[PDB]
Design a binder for this molecule. Structure first.
Ligand SMILES: O=c1ccn([C@@H]2O[C@H](COP(=O)(O)OP(=O)(O)O)[C@@H](O)[C@H]2O)c(=O)[nH]1
Ligand SMILES: O=c1ccn([C@@H]2O[C@H](COP(=O)(O)OP(=O)(O)O)[C@@H](O)[C@H]2O)c(=O)[nH]1
Ligand SMILES: [Mn+2]
Ligand SMILES: [Mn+2]
Lengths: 293, 293
């Protein structure tokens, strides 16, 4: 914990030059918004390697979504926390369908067998319960941070220790330039996910969040308990786990926010100038086909 | 610790508008640089009041510097952490010379009697030993954060919970626009404070640093132990405690950096456009007169 950095030679920070002139790089509660140009990865790598950091990555591959694992894991090997200790946790109803992907040194993979729900909405929402539960089973004793992502994705560029913090969310790529009234929060007061039209900082994506194990256990437990209240009341939030994630992060502000570099869809949104890197991207899929037998 | 924010109405953060176009607002290790325009103090106040935060302020008033206490404490009452629990710790060789300043509710003051050294350099440097020591005597059991400042100063504007973080330093007002080779770090390899010409992020001021009690105890202990090594080797760093502070913060990066709004000298430097507020400022003094009998 008490550990000195070695001597390093790198460019001097420039106090009187903004690191970005086109985007917000800090939230109003002083959380960094992580864009390329904001960080020197050499300094961050040193800080996190000196603390012997282990990062857990959770991914759900239930029913037909096992098809996405090979690309997901291959590309994670090229781009996700390279040089750091990584533990992948693949949650699936089909252990035998997990592809045999070759891992770099210091990286391991565990297959966690879980039930499949019929409705895609329930598969998506029940990730919160399943993550919270495994926080006691394994994660508290095995990793320092958890990164919780969608599987229908691939890494195309660096995703590293710059994201690590007690609690982070990611700007949804559909909404980063939108006004809060256009955000697709849950708007029915009868749901635990309700956010009024005059509230909201950002629209966070359900496909990429994380933090310390303690903060992720808190978040996932809270979202699951809220879902259960909604279920008892006969209501399902408009965007499922993402709606609840958004309510949680409004009331418990994240300590870093990831830019849409970290959660993108090039088919739908192209490659705008404001994105210097496209790091973690959607794999094209046919919702109706892939979500049903 | 687990505490939800209430509903709040405030302006939506603007993802595609920088909060400052003229200054760096985040370090390359993703620490916020605190300037006006970077923070919504209403959100921060909520976060810190929900955690029932107590802030300790240490100040040394040794020998003739007791004269600075009345203005220092009066202006702290107007501007420093108003609304939060505050404990002032006045270190002095003359308990009876501490002025009777009226305090707001939830704010208290303790007088800590310490020895006076002859040389101003030693008075300044021995603050590290004295702070580290009182971390066990009182601070661990009494406060959450410590703010450690010069007494030859006055508050002129808000200094609040925006500064609070595990470890912070402040940009020295003489050097915030300077290249690292112009920084007045200790440049003799025989001193524990030595920093080579090609290293250094910022020139931090010895007059304003702080953090959690744990991190402040670490810092002050390390700087005192380094001073003692230098003393045994017959060398005194060029800028005394400030030199050692700079070496420490180079190797243990702060989690926030305060802009020179928080440490200014209007007589020497005026009021540049880049400073929207002048918060904590030098009181004009005659070094030779005030540092000697
Ligand atoms: O049949 C399913 C449906 C969903 N998921 C998981 O739930 C996540 C969220 O669903 P999806 O990616 O379909 O949501 P979208 O990105 O299309 O909104 C997926 O990435 C998978 O990890 C799954 O494993 N199987
Ligand atoms: O005789 C002295 C000399 C120094 N100090 C303390 O040490 C700090 C640092 O010294 P000073 O302010 O003279 O340094 P400068 O700001 O002029 O570099 C002061 O603010 C006081 O808190 C003191 O109390 N008495
Ligand atoms: Mn998806
Ligand atoms: Mn001073």
């Amino acid at each position: 914990f008490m550990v000195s950095l070695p001597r390093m030679v790198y460019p001097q920070p420039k106090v009187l030059t903004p690191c970005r002139k086109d985007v917000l790089v800090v939230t109003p509660w002083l959380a960094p918004i992580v864009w390329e140009g904001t960080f020197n990865i050499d300094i961050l790598n040193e800080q996190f390697r000196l603390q012997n950091t282990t990062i857990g990555l959770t991914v759900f591959a239930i029913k037909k979504y096992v098809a996405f694992l090979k690309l997901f894991l291959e590309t994670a090997e090229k781009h996700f926390m390279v040089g750091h200790r990584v533990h992948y946790y693949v949650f699936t109803d089909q252990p035998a369908a997990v592809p045999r992907v070759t891992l770099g040194t210091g990286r391991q993979l565990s297959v966690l067998e879980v039930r499949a729900y019929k409705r895609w909405q329930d598969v998506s929402m029940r990730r919160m319960e399943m993550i919270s539960d495994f926080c006691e089973r394994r994660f508290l004793s095995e990793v320092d941070y958890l990164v919780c992502v969608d599987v229908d994705m691939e890494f195309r560029d660096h995703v590293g220790v710059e994201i690590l913090t007690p609690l982070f969310g990611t700007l949804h790529p559909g909404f980063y330039g939108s006004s809060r009234e256009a955000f697709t929060y849950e708007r029915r007061p009868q749901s635990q996910a309700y956010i009024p039209k005059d509230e909201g900082d950002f629209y966070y994506g359900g496909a990429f969040f994380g933090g310390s194990v303690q903060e992720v256990q808190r978040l996932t437990r809270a979202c699951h308990q809220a879902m259960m209240v909604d279920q008892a009341n006969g209501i399902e939030a408009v965007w499922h786990d993402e709606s609840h994630l958004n309510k949680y992060l409004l009331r418990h502000k994240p300590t870093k926010v990831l830019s849409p570099e970290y959660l993108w869809d090039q088919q739908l949104l192209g490659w705008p100038a404001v994105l210097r890197k496209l790091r973690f991207t959607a794999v094209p899929k046919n919702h109706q086909a892939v979500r049903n037998p």
